[PDB]
Amino acid sequence: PLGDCLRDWEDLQQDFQNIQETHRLYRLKLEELTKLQNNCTSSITRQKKRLQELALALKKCKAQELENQMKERQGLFFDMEAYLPKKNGLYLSLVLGNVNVTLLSKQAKFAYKDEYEKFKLYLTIILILISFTCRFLLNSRVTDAAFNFLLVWYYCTLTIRESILINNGSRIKGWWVFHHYVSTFLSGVMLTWPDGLMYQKFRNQFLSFSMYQSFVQFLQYYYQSGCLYRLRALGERHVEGFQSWMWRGLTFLLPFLFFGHFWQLFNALTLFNLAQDPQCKEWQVLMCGFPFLLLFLGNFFTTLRVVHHKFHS
Amino acid sequence: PLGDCLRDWEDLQQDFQNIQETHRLYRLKLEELTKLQNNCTSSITRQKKRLQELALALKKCKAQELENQMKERQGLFFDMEAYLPKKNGLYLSLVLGNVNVTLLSKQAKFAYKDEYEKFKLYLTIILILISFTCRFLLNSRVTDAAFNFLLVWYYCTLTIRESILINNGSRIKGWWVFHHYVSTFLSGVMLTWPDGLMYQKFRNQFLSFSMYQSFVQFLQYYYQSGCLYRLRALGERHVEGFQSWMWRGLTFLLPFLFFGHFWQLFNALTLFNLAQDPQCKEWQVLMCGFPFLLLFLGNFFTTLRVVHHKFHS
Ligand SMILES: CC(C)(COP(=O)(O)OP(=O)(O)OC[C@H]1O[C@@H](n2cnc3c(N)ncnc32)[C@H](O)[C@@H]1OP(=O)(O)O)[C@@H](O)C(=O)NCCC(=O)NCCS
C-alpha cells in the first residue's frame, strides 16, 4: 500500500544518490577524455604535418632506411587516426551534418561492416523480387517507378553507409561511391522517362540487367562477408590460410563481374542506337546511355586495377 | 642535409614516444569510460523500469507529493539519458546503421541545431530560386524534374537530421518527420506524372505553393534561430524576457502558416476536382491529391495543438 510505496521510494532514492554520484563521475571522465582526445588528435595532426614537411624535403634532397621507417610511421599514424574520430567528409557534412560517426573500437567497426553487408544482402533480396515482378509478372508503370525509387533510396543510403565506413579506417576505393551517385542519376533519369516506344524497347533489357546485377550482388555479399569473417578470425589468433580462399572466391567472382561490365557497355550501346531512331522524342535515352558507359568504364578500370593490385601483392 | 634529417627524425622519434604513451593512456581511459558509460546506461534503464512499475502500481492503488517527485524524477532521468547515448530509432538504424550519433555535450547539441537551421536556410535559398525559374522563367520538364528531385533529397536529408536531433534530447514532435515522408511521397508522385493537360493545369499552382512554402520557411528559420539563441543566452546567465519575443514571433508567424495550410487544402481540392475531368488519364492527380489533404490535416492539427500548448503554459 502506501507504506510499501514509501519504502520502495526510499530504496529508489538511495539508489538514486548512488547513480547520481556515478553520473557525476561519468561526466568528469567524459570531459577529461574529450580534452585528452582533442590533445591527441591535434598532436597527431601536427606530427604528420612536420613528418610530411621532412618527407618533401628529403624527396628533393636525394636514406632508404629513413624511407622505410617513415612509411611504417605513416601507416601506423593512419591506423591511430582511424582509431580516433576523423571528423566528416564533404558529403557526410552535407547530409549527416556536424555529427561524429566514430565507432572507436575495432569490434564496433567489424559490427558496422557486417551490418552493412547484411543490409546490402536484404535490399538485394527485396530488389531482385521487385525486379522479377517488374520484368516478368507485371508490365505496369507504377511498379517500375516504385522499383526505380527504391533503387534511388538504396543507392543513397549505401552512399551514406560507405561514407561512414570511409570515415573510420575502411579502404573503400573512391570509385564505388561515385558508382552509387551515377547509378542514382541513372535511376532518376529512368524515373522521368515518359511512356512510349523507346521506353518499351529498353525496359525489359534494363530490368534484366538489374536482376543480374542483384544476382551478382548476392555473390558479392557472400565473398565480402566471408573475407571479413576470415580477416576477423585470422586477426586475433584463429596469412596463407586466408589468401587461398580469397583468391578462389575472387576467381569464381570475376567472370560474373566482367559479364556485368559487358552488359553495362551493351546497355550503353543499345541506348546510343535507340537515340538515333526517327521515333525518338525523349531526351532520356541519350542522357541515360551516358551513365551506362561511365559505369562500364569506371567499374571495369577499377576492377582491373584492384585485380592487378591483388596479383602484385 | 642528411644530418639535419637525422636530427629532425630523432626529435620526431622522441615526440613519437611521448605521443604513443599519450595514445595508450587515451585508449585506457576510453575503455574505462565505455565500461562506466554502459554501466550508467544500464542502471538508468533498470531504475526507470522499476520506477514505472511503482508508478503503475500507485496509479491503480489510488500521495500527490509522491507524484510530483516522480514527475521531477522522470524529467531529470530524461535529461540524463539524453546526455548519454540513446541508441538509434527504427529509421536511423535502417538508413544510418548501428552507429552512434551522440553529441554528448550540450554545446554540441546547440551547434548541431544551429547548423541544421542554417542548412535548412541555405536549401530554402536554393529551392526558392529553382522554384522561381520553374514557375516564371522556364516552362521545361527537365527543370521541374530537377526541382522535384532536389525536393526529395532535401526532405530525406531533413528527415535524417531530425531523427538525429530526436535521438539526443530535442523534442521534435513526431508529426513533422511524417510530414517530411509525405512531402517526399508527393514529390515522387509528381516526378512520375507524365506531361499532359492535367499536369499543365496544376504545375503553376504547385510551383507557386512551393515558392510560398519556401518563403514561409525563411521566416520559420528566422523565428527558430532567434528562439534557439535566446534559449542559449537565457540558459547560462544572459524567463519573461524570452517569452515576450517568442510570442511576438509566434503571432507574426502564425497567419503565414495558416495561409500555407489553406493553400495545401486548396491544392488537395484542386487535384480532387481535376481527377474528375473527362480528359484525365493520369492516376497521379488522384494519388497526389491525397498527400496535400493529409499534409493540411496533420499540419493544421499539429499547429493548433502546439499553439494551445504554448497558450496553456
Ligand atoms: C575485387 C572486388 C570484387 C572485392 O575485392 P576486395 O576484397 O574487397 O578488395 P579491396 O581492395 O577493394 O578491399 C578494400 C575495401 O573496399 C571494400 N570494397 C571492395 N569492393 C567494394 C564495393 N563494390 N563497394 C563497397 N566497398 C567495397 C572492401 O570491403 C574492402 O574493405 P576493407 O576496408 O576492410 O579493406 C571489388 O572489386 C568489388 O567488389 N567489385 C564490384 C564491382 C561490381 O559490382 N560491378 C557491377 C557488376 S554488374
Ligand SMILES: CC(C)(COP(=O)(O)OP(=O)(O)OC[C@H]1O[C@@H](n2cnc3c(N)ncnc32)[C@H](O)[C@@H]1OP(=O)(O)O)[C@@H](O)C(=O)NCCC(=O)NCCS
Ligand atoms: C509553433 C511552431 C511555428 C514552432 O514553435 P516552437 O518554438 O518550435 O514550439 P515546439 O513545441 O514545437 O518546440 C519543440 C521542438 O520542436 C522543434 N520544431 C518545432 N517545429 C518544427 C518543425 N516544423 N520541424 C522540425 N522541428 C521543429 C523546435 O525546434 C523545438 O526544438 P527543441 O527540442 O529545442 O525544443 C511550429 O508549429 C512549426 O514550426 N510549424 C511549421 C508548420 C509548417 O511549416 N507548415 C507548412 C506551412 S506551408
